[PDB]
């Protein structure tokens, strides 16, 4: 496989390598707070883990959309790749099992810590898009 793609690519013809669970995502584990205060008791934003070939994103809202318009809070998470993939087979499941238990998380600059005690609803109105 590798000596055939060595020769096709040396003449400028189209090549291709077939992978099983390719390491396309660099390791990243962080968060984003769209609403915060120094008490850290009314928050909103997303958390994610990108590692290997797996994305687990989870959005939270402490008020549970009590003052949102039509009681709906919108979330979004955009992951750019490094190389263009072709003909992928992707499994999508409606729960982030890693962001489901109570934990304490440091602040953005490492100053203080804040507490996150989740209960989990189902995701409403899911849309996954594949851009080029």
Partner 1 sequence: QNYGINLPITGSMDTAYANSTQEETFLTSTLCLYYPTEAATEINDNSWKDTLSQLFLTKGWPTGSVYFKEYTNIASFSVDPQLYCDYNVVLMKYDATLQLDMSELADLILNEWLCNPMDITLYYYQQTDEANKWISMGSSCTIKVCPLNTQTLGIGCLTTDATTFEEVATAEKLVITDVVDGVNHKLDVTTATCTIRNCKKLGPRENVAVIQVGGSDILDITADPTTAPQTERMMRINWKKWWQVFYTVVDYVDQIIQVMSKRSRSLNSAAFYYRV
Residue 63 binding partner 1, by CB under 8 A: no
Residue 23 binding partner 1, by CB under 8 A: no
State in angstroms the smallest separation of the CB of 122 from partner 1.
Answer: 6
Q: What gap in Å lies between CA 127 and CA 125, rounded to an integer? A: 7
State how beta strands 113-116 and 44-52 pair: unpaired
Residue 129 binding partner 1, by CB under 8 A: no
Residue 111 binding partner 1, by CB under 8 A: yes
Q: Which of residues 5, 24, 25, 33 is near partner 1 by CB under 8 A?
A: 33
Cβ-contact 50, 88 below 8 angstroms: no
Q: What gap in Å lies between CA 85 and CA 120, rounded to an integer? A: 33
Q: Which of residues 6, 30, 79, 118 is near partner 1 by CB under 8 A?
A: 30
**R_g of the chain, CA atoms, integer Å:** 20
| 77 marked as binding residue | no
């Amino acid at each position: 496989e590798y000596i055939e793609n060595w020769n096709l690519q040396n003449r400028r013809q189209r090549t291709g390598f077939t992978f099983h669970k390719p390491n396309i995502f660099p390791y990243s584990a962080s968060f984003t707070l769209n609403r915060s205060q120094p008490a850290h008791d009314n928050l909103m934003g997303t958390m994610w883990l990108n590692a290997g070939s797996e994305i687990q994103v989870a959005g939270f809202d402490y008020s549970c959309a009590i003052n949102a318009p039509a009681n709906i809070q919108q979330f979004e998470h955009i992951v750019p790749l490094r190389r263009v993939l072709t003909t992928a087979t992707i499994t999508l499941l409606p729960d982030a099992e890693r962001f489901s238990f109570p934990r304490v998380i440091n602040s953005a600059d490492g100053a203080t810590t804040w507490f996150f005690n989740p209960v989990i609803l189902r995701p409403n109105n899911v849309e996954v898009e594949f851009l080029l």
